[PDB]
Amino acid sequence: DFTLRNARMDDIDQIIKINRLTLPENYPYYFFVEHLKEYGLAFFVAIVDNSVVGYIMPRIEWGFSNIKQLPSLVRKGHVVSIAVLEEYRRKGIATTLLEASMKSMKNDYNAEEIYLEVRVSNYPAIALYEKLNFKKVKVLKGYYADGEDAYLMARP
């Protein structure tokens, strides 16, 4: 089984290692640090045997809604990055990380809606998000480097 706690500065080495093994968007270390500094309460790691096997990196934003029809300014949570090491997948880790991060986005940071972007080919993640009541809002054409479309997904 696994446990969740808030990420700490000394987790970043392991967070970056997971990021680089699992995802092509390889953000600089300082990028991870900025999110930990500003939105840390909603930045979680999953722990198995005193090591990090998963994380969720959040951002809290203010701007136009991705959900309302008429332009509408809101406080919104943004899932920037989420990953689980291969060996530890399908154990409910990402679900747990997401539920924990979303709680904090709303309760610590006053987020009113939550959104993310995902590769249209990333069926495991799309399935995860739809389980947690995210809906496809629109296709961001050619969002990824090389040209892959993203779904913008958002949750009221």
Query: What does the binding site for Cl ion look like in residue numbers (CB under 5 A)?
Result: 144, 146, 148
Query: Does 135 help bind ligand COA (rule: CB under 6 A)?
Result: no
**CA nearest to 115, candidates 63, 68, 64, 152:** 152
Pull the structure tokens for residue 41: 């309460």
Complete DSSP assignment for 11-28: GHHHHHHHHHHH-S----
Query: Does 145 help bind ligand COA (rule: CB under 6 A)?
Result: no
127 backbone dihedrals φ, ψ, rounded to 5°: -60, -50
Q: Does residue 155 contact residue 132 with C-beta atoms inside 8 Å?
A: yes
**84 known ligand binder:** yes
Return the residue matching tokens 């409910």: 92
**86 known ligand binder:** no
**47 known ligand binder:** no
Choices 4-12, 106-114, 119-127, 140-148; region in contact with ligand COA by CB under 6 A: 119-127
Q: Which does 122 bind (CB under 5 to 8 A by kind): Cl ion, ligand COA, none?
A: ligand COA
Q: What is the CA radius of gyration of the chain?
A: 15
Residues 71-110 that bind ligand COA (CB under 6 A): 82-84, 89-95
**91 known ligand binder:** yes
- In sequence order, what are the residues at sequence separation of 6 or more whose Cβ sits closer than 8 angstroms to the Cβ of residue 150? 117, 118, 119, 120, 139, 140, 143, 144
**CA nearest to 115, candidates 136, 95, 96:** 136
Residues 6-25 that bind ligand COA (CB under 6 A): 22-23
Query: Does 156 help bind ligand COA (rule: CB under 6 A)?
Result: no
Q: Which does 22 bind (CB under 5 to 8 A by kind): ligand COA, Cl ion, none?
A: ligand COA
Task: Give least dist CB 120 to ligand COA, A.
Answer: 11
Which residues are at the interface with ligand COA (CB under 6 A)?
22-23, 82-84, 89-95, 118, 122-125, 127-128, 131
